[PDB]
Design a protein around this ligand. Sequence first.
Ligand code: ATP
Ligand code: ATP
Ligand code: ATP
Ligand code: K
Ligand code: K
Ligand code: K
Ligand code: MG
Ligand code: MG
Ligand code: MG
Lengths: 524, 523, 523
Amino acid sequence: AAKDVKFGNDARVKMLRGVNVLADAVKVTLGPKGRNVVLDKSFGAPTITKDGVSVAREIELEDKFENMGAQMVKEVASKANDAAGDGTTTATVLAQAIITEGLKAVAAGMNPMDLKRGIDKAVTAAVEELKALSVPCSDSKAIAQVGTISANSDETVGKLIAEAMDKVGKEGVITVEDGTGLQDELDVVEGMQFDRGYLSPYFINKPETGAVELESPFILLADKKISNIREMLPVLEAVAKAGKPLLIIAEDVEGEALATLVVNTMRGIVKVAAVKAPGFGDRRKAMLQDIATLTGGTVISEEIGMELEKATLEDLGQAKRVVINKDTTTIIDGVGEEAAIQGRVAQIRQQIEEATSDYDREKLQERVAKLAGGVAVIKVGAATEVEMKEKKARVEDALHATRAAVEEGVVAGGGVALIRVASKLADLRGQNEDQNVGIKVALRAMEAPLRQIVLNCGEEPSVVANTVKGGDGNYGYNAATEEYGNMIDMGILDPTKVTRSALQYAASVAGLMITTECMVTDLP
Amino acid sequence: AAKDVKFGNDARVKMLRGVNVLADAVKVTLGPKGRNVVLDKSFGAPTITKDGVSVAREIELEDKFENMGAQMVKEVASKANDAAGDGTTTATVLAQAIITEGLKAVAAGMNPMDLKRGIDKAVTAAVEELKALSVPCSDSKAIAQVGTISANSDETVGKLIAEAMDKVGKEGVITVEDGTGLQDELDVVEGMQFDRGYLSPYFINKPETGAVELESPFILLADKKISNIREMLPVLEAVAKAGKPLLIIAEDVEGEALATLVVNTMRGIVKVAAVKAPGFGDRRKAMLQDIATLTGGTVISEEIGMELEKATLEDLGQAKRVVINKDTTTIIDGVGEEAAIQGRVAQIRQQIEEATSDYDREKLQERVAKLAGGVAVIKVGAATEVEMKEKKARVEDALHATRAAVEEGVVAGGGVALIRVASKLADLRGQNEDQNVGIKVALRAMEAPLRQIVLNCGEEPSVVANTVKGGDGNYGYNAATEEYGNMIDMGILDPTKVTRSALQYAASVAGLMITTECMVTDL
Amino acid sequence: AAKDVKFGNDARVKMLRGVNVLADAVKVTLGPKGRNVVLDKSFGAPTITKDGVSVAREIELEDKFENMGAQMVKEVASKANDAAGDGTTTATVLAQAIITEGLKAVAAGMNPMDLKRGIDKAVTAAVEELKALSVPCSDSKAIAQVGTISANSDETVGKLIAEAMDKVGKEGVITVEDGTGLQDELDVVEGMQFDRGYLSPYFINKPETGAVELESPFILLADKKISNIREMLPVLEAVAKAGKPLLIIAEDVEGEALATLVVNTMRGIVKVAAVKAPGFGDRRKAMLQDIATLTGGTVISEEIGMELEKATLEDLGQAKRVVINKDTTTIIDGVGEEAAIQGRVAQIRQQIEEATSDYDREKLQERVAKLAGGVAVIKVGAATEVEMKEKKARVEDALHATRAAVEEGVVAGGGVALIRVASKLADLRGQNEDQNVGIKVALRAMEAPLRQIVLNCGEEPSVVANTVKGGDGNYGYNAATEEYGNMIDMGILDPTKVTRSALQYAASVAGLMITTECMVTDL
Ligand SMILES: Nc1ncnc2c1ncn2[C@@H]1O[C@H](COP(=O)(O)OP(=O)(O)OP(=O)(O)O)[C@@H](O)[C@H]1O
Ligand SMILES: Nc1ncnc2c1ncn2[C@@H]1O[C@H](COP(=O)(O)OP(=O)(O)OP(=O)(O)O)[C@@H](O)[C@H]1O
Ligand SMILES: Nc1ncnc2c1ncn2[C@@H]1O[C@H](COP(=O)(O)OP(=O)(O)OP(=O)(O)O)[C@@H](O)[C@H]1O
Ligand SMILES: [K+]
Ligand SMILES: [K+]
Ligand SMILES: [K+]
Ligand SMILES: [Mg+2]
Ligand SMILES: [Mg+2]
Ligand SMILES: [Mg+2]
């Protein structure tokens, strides 16, 4: 359709007004004293949230140029949530401050391209200084503090996430889901815990629990679906000769074969039980082979060539314990070679590195946590649905912050890290004066997270920013108690990945936005 | 007519929005780095001003509740201008800060009238501490610096005011008028100044200042009261064609014989005005004879017997300029005869030597002081009329500030004195907790002039205010050079009267107006 | 009423948009290649003008903020026209350039008051360098070239003004009026000129120039002042039908009762005017007698004894034309008797020879200079009324430029003098960096007249400006022939007063108005 075209300072003012609207919506949540934002949902109750990415996503303005500004600065929070999962509010606070100060220098006649080059140089040096300033975060108390701070100073969430990471180890996978109670519940599972139940209700060895218990059972892995008892009849006879129980992981055991095997189960000759193979095509085979590696067995398939008729006891897998139930199944201490397990771990890690999709990579990480280590599920307990959503978002942010802490390290929180970085970058210079001014607006905008935290606390941002800049090291401002001290000692830690990602994405988008002169939108 | 009524928080936020609009329009002019405001006038070209009271008076909002708030804060600037002539922007800034903090405290559930009592107690104690903190102008001797600071850091205006007050004395009358060239001029000429008032409000000239001016005025003097119009009709007829506006100095004139007939007869080509005669009886005759001898005229008396019909144009006196104001009427330059003026001066000096009673001696020393001091006139030199108006307003502000400085004293400028008196009152407590919070509101709002000065400088008001409060004494923040130092040493001095009046009027209106729950206006 | 208030950049860009509209409408007329502007008038046919002040005065915008900006820049052209009479377009162009560059520097975050101080310092130094650069104008060819350049390169107007100033002297009075024919006619007739102004503002005629004119006026002279109306009512009765407008020259005229009574009695059929007489006492009587003998009339005096009622139509004087302005009143042609005028001239010259006092000799030789010079009346010959108005405005501009040239001096035309004085001030520095940027803004805006002249020529202003700045002295760019050369040699001379006044008034208003953060207007 027809277009409205704005040029120069008019377009810059409209875009900055949109950025200010989005950033003022976002930044009322920053810090521990930050407040919540209600987002109207056309389907369901409104969402009360303290995370900046949701309130950034929900912002869309009537003025098309202001809507441009809002969308472009919303990209900052979207990217910061995609990469680190935390610091979206900090990223938007940084992006707004670079844009306002960058447009001040743009209105001062300085070249926006050179300003963007200066911002990029300053933020590259800032990332280097953050990496130098960072301390690795491996101990449990530091992780608990990171999870607490990232969850609006909720010590319960931080300690629960610290315990979960301690339980599942470094290779473990932790996810957050809703709970039925009012309290946070941690559910840690070990070994293979694929979510398929028994094909028939009659396998139950323990009727008082509905769970089949198999002590040191054999494990058959059929990559094909079976409906006749003929094929594994030699295997069934060999198992009956051995006398140990047998568990089948197959694509489908149904009809005739299933009926005869449950009949043989209640006859007592074989304590057999069959369950469906997990996943779907191109994924079922890989983690079926993972189960085989864990249990020291081999998968029976037509592609690999051997049939169930020539399958023997050596072909079948081995574990010390097997638990069947309605929804899932647990295999405890599969008898497999350790070196093969680590080789499979390395292979799936290489697949993770080669994976360019979040879904495939997260499935591979889940498989790694299944075969090695454990899986933790955090049930968010809340009296109401809106508190469930708010607490779930906070726990997710805390989990992402703990993951970023172990990935890259921690720095002093509350924006003190960016303050120290900007203080260290005082002598950085560009190629010309416009680049130096861009560096200076980048350094000044690194004070924006601390200033906005103090503004949310109700104190004076200038006084506290100058006081923190006067101090050295991790000395900073406790925004909850409104005091001063070594931010590490008071447990206010920020993930280096979160702060660095927020700074980088804010700098990139903000430089691209201050470089603009003309904006072309649709007419109202 | 039909009334729109708002209650509680709705009325309070509407009123505070009006306060904020007026106070922003005023506060953009505070400090040396403050900017100008253009006021559109249907009279002529728009006027550029750095004066707070002009911007405040020109503000009127469309929303009736916001308009009520704007008018009520405009009262602050108007009262500050009437009482001191300077600090209207400071008064408006202090008023807005008190209103904002007091309304925050009202929203905090606390009693607004106890807040008002606390503000009043805090400002009474601050006035006491400002009187204690004040340095007399004789001890300071910084009239040039005070005039420079009040003229937006213009050293020429301060130097001119200092020279005028050195020539005609600290109590001498100084009058600001438009010059002809591009440069300011100082002329100490023989003149008269008497604290008397014009009679009927239909004599106001084209300027809106309320003081009428006359170009080469005719002077008529009388101690007895006229009995009929036909007695003084030829005299008016004598001024009917003679190109000198008639100023009549008599005891007291009513409107029935003069004002109504001169309104009906005359459309206003030449301003004819009458004034009261200061003193009574022998004193009235004495100053009438003195003014007649200044202007070369004569005084008609019953004992003399010479009537106004026999009076001619040459017999009556003539001046070069006369400015009539309600507070004080001045004759800038009466020619007369210099030898006659000197002889009259010597005669009154010999009368001083002869006289011995305290009242006669003091009134006669007042006469000789008025004669010797004369009138100092400052010609505002500017290239254009808008520059003329702006520079005239700045010189008038400098004159008012220097007069307040010699009358009351001087303190540290740039809101530093208010910072100091707020620091000295941290121990002050009211009757209850609400009064204590009102005291804290007043003390926090006393920092507002400095913070607004810094905001106009573009720096950080919190950092500068905390640095100044960390210091003691005249330590403050030079906003012209953006750096700290002893405020007296760098010449940034504020009149004690100006600061005290701004604080008092802002506190009074703001404390009265934070106690409002309901607001009633038209629709 | 209700006020719309704008702040900061919004108010600044609205005001600058108004400035740009007014300045474009004015600037399309700059230079020899500049075009005309048609102004619609409610009284009749539209007027075509190349004069900047007419276009500037007629500009009024619908948007209130833009209208305020337009009025403030209209002040520049009005002041330039009132002072010099030429360079209104140059003044507006310089004003707009200073406003644009200063607002750019304000958007650059810098202090606008320091920018204003820098602009004022730079323009003061430029005025000094223009006084140094000025060459005294003591050539008839220089007068002709100044008149030609100021009349849009019309050599006939320049030659006519040169002949007039050669005939009546460089200090003689020259009056421009309409001519019946299609050609300009220079007539050096015997006339009177005295620097006096009218009293009653009602006496302004149908033309809006502020000067009244009379067709074959009756002359009345007086050294004493009458008392009642009845002393002059019969004369007012006689002139009531006499066919000649009654001009009265008394000692000190006033419309205290004359103006209102003549307003009530007369609706405006024929103008009646009263003006002051120059001098006082014996000197006033001397010039009154001289004017009476020039017009063949008599002066009423108490010593002489002859009264107004005694005087008849034949006894009192009569003239052919009288033009009354506030600055100076002229009697273009008082017939009287030629032999009587010659005898009076001889007697007054004999009075010079007899007198030995310096003041007496100088006033008597002023009398004979006024008598001998007379009035040089220029008849504007044009085929139509709109052409008559345009050519009359051009001749008036040429006259004002020649007056400013013989008063102050001449410099290179076409903005070259401003280019040179901007080049000489590249070393000038202010108190701080913001004042330096204001100085640079003023210096860059001093190139604006030349750049706008080139833009009206259609060539490239940057190339021509850089070529001129590369040169030195009177080297400049002849815009009539679109080629470079010595500005003085090809006769493109500008008055020093015109350029200096344009620069000063533009600088004053622009420096005052780039310092504005808030603007308050109606809704
Ligand atoms: N008690 C505290 N004292 C000081 N700083 C704190 C405190 N608690 C949190 N912070 C700081 O608050 C900043 C941001 O907190 P918050 O979690 O609300 O924002 P965010 O991570 O930017 O937002 P989001 O979850 O939308 O990505 C961090 O830099 C953190 O160090
Ligand atoms: N160089 C300076 N440094 C610091 N403060 C200054 C300086 N010059 C002036 N001030 C302060 O700024 C104020 C003067 O501002 P301004 O004269 O514009 O307004 P005002 O005094 O409130 O009154 P008004 O607007 O009626 O003239 C005073 O408080 C004075 O002490
Ligand atoms: N032939 C020419 N070559 C170069 N410059 C010229 C020439 N003729 C005139 N000028 C210049 O152009 C200007 C005259 O233009 P114009 O008379 O239209 O406007 P102005 O002087 O600004 O005043 P106004 O519009 O009030 O008459 C002067 O600066 C003069 O020096
Ligand atoms: K947040
Ligand atoms: K002010
Ligand atoms: K022109
Ligand atoms: Mg967060
Ligand atoms: Mg002031
Ligand atoms: Mg011209």
